[PDB]
Design a protein around this ligand. Structure first.
Ligand SMILES: Nc1[nH]c(=O)nc2c1ncn2[C@H]1C[C@H](O)[C@@H](COP(=O)(O)O)O1
Ligand SMILES: [Mn+2]
Ligand SMILES: [Mn+2]
Ligand SMILES: [Mn+2]
Length: 156
């Protein structure tokens, strides 16, 4: 049994495009990803997701909907990353570059999978189909999956 730390991941998914951020520094730098980060003490997971979306993309939203949960394990790290995944189609304002992220829209036939975390190739398609999911991925380093599980669920 391991301990796990809570993180959020937020996808702004519209009918024909999705907003991703190019991670400019830190964990997973150089990859397009959803917006998010560690949940802080006192806030709900959803509100932590809203906070990180605002900080990293400039977008304020009143609500997010939970679409999945993914646990990440890295060789040599005893702590698991428990990532709660949220979506919304409804945004106010324009995305703004932050120190952490450069936001960019992608058409839904141009999802940049080769420049995203490898796990996204497995669970992102479920997100696009408006399905809910639970996943687990064990990584050697940043590039290599050694074991994983992915399951569609009716309730996250
Ligand atoms: N394997 C992975 N696939 C993915 O799509 N996002 C990941 C990830 N591993 C971590 N993340 C996300 C979760 C958080 O939004 C963020 C890690 O927290 P910060 O580096 O503090 O933003 O990266
Ligand atoms: Mn952050
Ligand atoms: Mn943070
Ligand atoms: Mn972050």
């Amino acid at each position: 049994m391991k301990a796990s730390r809570l993180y959020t991941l937020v996808l702004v998914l519209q009918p024909q495009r999705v907003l991703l951020g190019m991670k400019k520094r830190g964990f997973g730098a150089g990859r397009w990803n959803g917006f998010g980060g560690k949940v802080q003490e006192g806030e709900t997971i959803e509100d932590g997701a809203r906070r990180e979306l605002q900080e990293e993309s400039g977008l304020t939203v009143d609500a997010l909907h939970k679409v999945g949960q993914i646990v990440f394990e890295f060789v040599g790290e005893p702590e698991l990353m428990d990532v709660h995944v949220f979506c919304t189609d409804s945004i106010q304002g324009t995305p703004v570059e932050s120190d952490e992220m450069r936001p960019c829209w992608f058409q839904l036939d141009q999802i940049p999978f080769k420049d995203m975390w490898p796990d996204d190739s497995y669970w992102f398609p479920l997100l696009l189909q408006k399905k809910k999911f639970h996943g687990y991925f064990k990584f050697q380093g940043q590039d290599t999956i050694l074991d994983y599980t992915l399951r569609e669920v009716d309730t996250v």
